[PDB]
Amino acid sequence: EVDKRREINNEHPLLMMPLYANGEEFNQGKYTFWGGDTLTGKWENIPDDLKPYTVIQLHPDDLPKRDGAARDFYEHMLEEAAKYVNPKTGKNEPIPVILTVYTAGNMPYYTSAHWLSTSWIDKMYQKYPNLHGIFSTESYWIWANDIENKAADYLKVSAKNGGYFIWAEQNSGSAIEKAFGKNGKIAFQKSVDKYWKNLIFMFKNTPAAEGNDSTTESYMKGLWLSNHTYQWGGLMDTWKWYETGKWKLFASGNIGKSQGDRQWLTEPESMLGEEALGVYLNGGVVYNFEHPAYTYGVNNKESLLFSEVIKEFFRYVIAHPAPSKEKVLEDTKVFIHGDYSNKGNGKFFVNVNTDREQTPLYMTGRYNVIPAIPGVLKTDKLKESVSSSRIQIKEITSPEFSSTQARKEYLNKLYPMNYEGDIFAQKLDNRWFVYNYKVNENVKQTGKLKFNSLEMNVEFEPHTYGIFERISNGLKVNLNNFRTNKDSLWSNAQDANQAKKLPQLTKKGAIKWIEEHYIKDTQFGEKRVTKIVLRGIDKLPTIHSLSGTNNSYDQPSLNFDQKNHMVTITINSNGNLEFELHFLEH
C-alpha cells in the first residue's frame, strides 16, 4: 500500500467543491468556470476551518469534444492549484484537487473526458502531489461496454499513487449491481478485492423519477460495511425537481421535464440538509451537490443555500463525527444480500421507510438505512469483522422480504419502535434527529421523542429538520427550516399548463437570476412556527447561546406551566437556529 494522499473518514469527512469548465469561453482562449468562480478565489473564500475537509472537483462540462481539450484545461488548473500562495502568510500551499475523468460513459459524443487516458492520469498524479483523486459520475443511463474495465483501471491507478477513485452512480438499470459483476463484467469486482481502501462509492440522486434513492443508498452503506469501499457518501441534486416534473412549491399539477432551469432552483434549501442527514446518520462521510450555482454559489460568493444549510451541516459533521464503521456494524440487525433490481427497486422500501416511490427522504428512522450488497458479491469480509457477530445476513429472496407487509413484520422484531408520531426521527446516542418528510405538500407533522423520562413533542412544517441533544444542563437545539420564496420564477403561470409553456429560463438565465435575485435582493420566505414541548421539567428553563441566520428569527417564546411541569417553546423563523435550554428534570 502506498501512503494515502489524504484521509477520508468520519473524523476527516469530505465536501467536494465543484467547478465546471466553461467550454464556450475555452473556445475564446479563456480558462473559466460556469458561474464565474475562479479556482484560487473559490479556495480562498472557503472558511479556514473547512479547508482541511474540502477538495476542489474540476468537471469538464461543455469543453469541446476533441482530443486535448480536457487535458489542456485540466493542466492549466492543476498548475494554478499547485502554485497557489496563501496571501496572509506568503507560503506556497497547493490547493487539493479531484479531476472528473469519466462521465456519460465517456462517449465521444457526450464528453471531452473521453480523451483522458489512464497514462495521462498517472502522469498527473506523479506531477501533482495536490491531485488527491479522480471522479466518475453519472453513467447509469449510458452503461458503456467497457465501463467496469475502465473503472478497474481508475481504481488501480489511484491506488498506485495513493489517491482515491470516487464513483457517483445511481442503481438505475441495475448500475451498481453491474459495476460489481452482475452481468459477468468482473474487472472492477477483481480490482475492488485488491484496492477497496482507495475507493469511495457515492449515490447520485439525480434520476429521481426512477425512484432508486433508497436502494442505492442501501447499497452504498452495505458496500462500506462489507469492505467493498473505503467510505461512502452521496451527490444530492436539485435537478431532481426537474426529473420529477414539479414546479412552484406546493402547487398542483405536473409539468414534466419542461422547465429545467426554473426547476433546479426550486427545491427548498433546507431539504438538502434533510437529504444529507441520510448520509451522516448512516456513517457516510463524502458530500457533493448539484446544481452548483444554487448549492454552492457564483462569482466566488457563497449562495444562501450554501451558507445557511450546507456549510452549517458540514461543520456539524466535523464537530460530531458520523458513526464509525464499528459502531454502525454493532447497531446493524439486518444486512441484505441480493439484487434490488429483482425486488421492485425503490418500491422495496415504500411504506417500509419511504412514503412514496420518488423521494430522497425517509418517513421513519426505526430501521435507519438497511444495508445491502448486490447478489454478485460475497459477505465473507463482513463476516470476518469482529463487529458483525449479531447481524442477521439475509438473502433478498428470503420470504421475509417478499412483500411490504413481510418486510415490516420481520424488521419490527429486530428494530424496536422508539418514538411516536408520523414524522421522521432517528436517535444517535443522546441526540434526536427529526425532520418533516413531506416533499411538496404543505402539511405539518408531529412526533413524541423521549430522553429517558423527559418527553419532547415537536411540531414541524415541511422542509424543517432539527437536532436535539440532551446535555448535562439541559438541551442543545439546532434547527434549520431555511426556505426562500421561489414563486417569482413561476410568475405568469396560474396552473401547470401555463407553467409548462413559460419561456425557458436557460442556463445563462438561471445563473443571471442567481446573481440578480438570490445573491442579492433575495426574496426570503416568511417566518414560520416550530413548536417544542418538554414534559418533566422542574422550573422555567433559561435560554442560552441563541444565534442563527441574520434577521431570520423572532425571540423564542417560553411558556412554563408549573402545575404540569412542562414548557412550550414557540419559535417563528426561517433559517438556521441554535440555542441551549437549561433546566432540571422533575
Ligand X SMILES: CC(=O)N[C@@H]1[C@@H](O)[C@@H](O)[C@@H](CO)O[C@@H]1O
Ligand Y SMILES: C[C@@H]1O[C@@H](O[C@@H]2[C@@H](O)[C@@H](O)[C@@H](CO)O[C@H]2O)[C@@H](O)[C@H](O)[C@@H]1O
Count CB atoms within 10 A of the CB of residue 430.
Answer: 14
In whole angstroms, what is the distance from residue 300 CA to residue 75 CA? 21
CA–CA dist 357, 345 (Å, integer): 9
The 273-312 contact track toward ligand Y, x by CB under 6 A, reads -----------------x----------------------
Binds ligand Y by CB under 6 A, chosen from 169, 210, 243, 275 = 243
Strand order in the sheet with 424-428: 424-428, 431-435, 465-471, 474-480, 576-582, 542-548
- Minimum Å distance from CB 291 to ligand X? 4
Out of ligand X, ligand Y, none, what residue 178 binds, judged by CB under 5 to 8 A for its kind, is none
Nearer to ligand X, 19 or 439 (CB): 19
Taking the least distance from each CB to ligand X, the nearer of 257 and 413 is: 257
Structural element, H or E, at residue 298: strand 297-298
Q: How far is the CA of 385 from the CAs of 217, 326, 393, in angstroms?
A: 22, 9, 13
Residue in the shown chain whose Cβ atom is closest to ligand X: 290
Q: Strand pairing partners for 16?
A: 55
Q: Which does 138 bind (CB under 5 to 8 A by kind): ligand X, ligand Y, none?
A: ligand Y
Which residue in the shown chain puts its C-beta closest to ligand Y? 103
| Residue 242 near ligand Y by CB under 6 A | yes
* Shortest Å distance, C-beta 150 to ligand X: 22
394 touches which of ligand X, ligand Y, none (CB within 5 to 8 A by kind)? none
Which range in 165-173, 286-294, 495-503, 562-570 contacts ligand X by CB under 6 A?
A: 286-294
d(CA 193, CA 531): 50
- Return the number of the residue (150 or 337) whose C-beta is nearest ligand Y: 150
d(CA 27, CA 68): 13
Task: Check: CB of residue 536 under 8 Å from CB of residue 293.
Answer: no
Backbone angles phi, psi at 360, to 5 degrees: -95, 10
The distance of closest approach from Cβ of residue 459 to ligand X in the complex, given in angstroms and rounded to an integer, is 35
18 binds, among ligand X, ligand Y, none (CB under 5 to 8 A by kind): none
- Considering the complex, state which of residue 189 and residue 212 has its C-beta at the smaller distance from ligand Y: 212
Q: Is 156 in the site for ligand X (CB under 6 A)?
A: no
Q: Count CB-CB contacts under 10 A for residue 84.
A: 18
Q: How far apart are CA 250 and CA 227, in angstroms?
A: 42
Query: What's the closest the beta carbon of residue 78 comes to ligand X, in angstroms?
Result: 21
The correct pick among 32, 112, 206, 216 for binding ligand Y (CB under 6 A) is 206
Task: Based on the shown chain and the rule CB under 6 A, indicate whether residue 169 belongs to the binding site for ligand Y.
Answer: no
Q: How many Å apart are CA 406 and CA 410, to the nearest integer? A: 6
DSSP states of 90-107 as a string?
Answer: --B-PPPEEEEEEEGGG-
231 to 260: interface string for ligand X, x by CB under 6 A: -----------------------------x
Site map (CB under 6 A) of ligand X, residues 53-82, x = contact: --------xx--------------------
Report residue 363 as a C-alpha cell: 418517513
Task: Give whole-number Cα distances, 476 to 193, 434, 451, 543, in Å.
Answer: 43, 14, 13, 10
Residue 290 binding ligand X, by CB under 6 A: yes
User: Is residue 182 near ligand X by the rule CB under 6 A?
Assistant: no
Residues across the chain = 586
Q: How far is the CB of 209 from ligand Y (least distance, A)?
A: 9
Judging by beta carbons within 10 Å of its beta carbon (0-12, 13-18, 19+), is residue 89 exposed, middle or buried? exposed
Peptide bond before 291: cis, by omega within 30 degrees of 0?
A: yes
User: Where does this chain touch ligand Y (CB under 6 A) — which range of 118-126, 235-243, 476-484, 556-564?
Assistant: 235-243
One-letter amino acid at 556 equals P
- State the number of binding residues for ligand X (CB under 6 A): 9
Closest approach of Cβ 376 to ligand Y, in Å? 25
Is residue 112 a contact residue for ligand Y (CB under 6 A)?
no
Q: For 546-576, b where at least 16 C-beta lie within 10 A, e where not — what string?
A: eebbeebbeebebebeeeeebbebebebbbb
Of 239, 296, 335, 490, the residue at the interface with ligand Y (CB under 6 A) is: 239
Please pick, from the candidates 137, 174, 226, 440, the single residue that binds ligand Y as defined by CB under 6 A: 137
Q: Which of 204, 291, 427, 483 lies at the binding interface for ligand X (CB under 6 A)?
A: 291
Per CB under 6 A, residues contacting ligand X are 20, 34, 61-62, 260, 290-292, 507
Per CB under 6 A, residues contacting ligand Y are 59, 103-104, 137-138, 206, 239, 242-243, 290
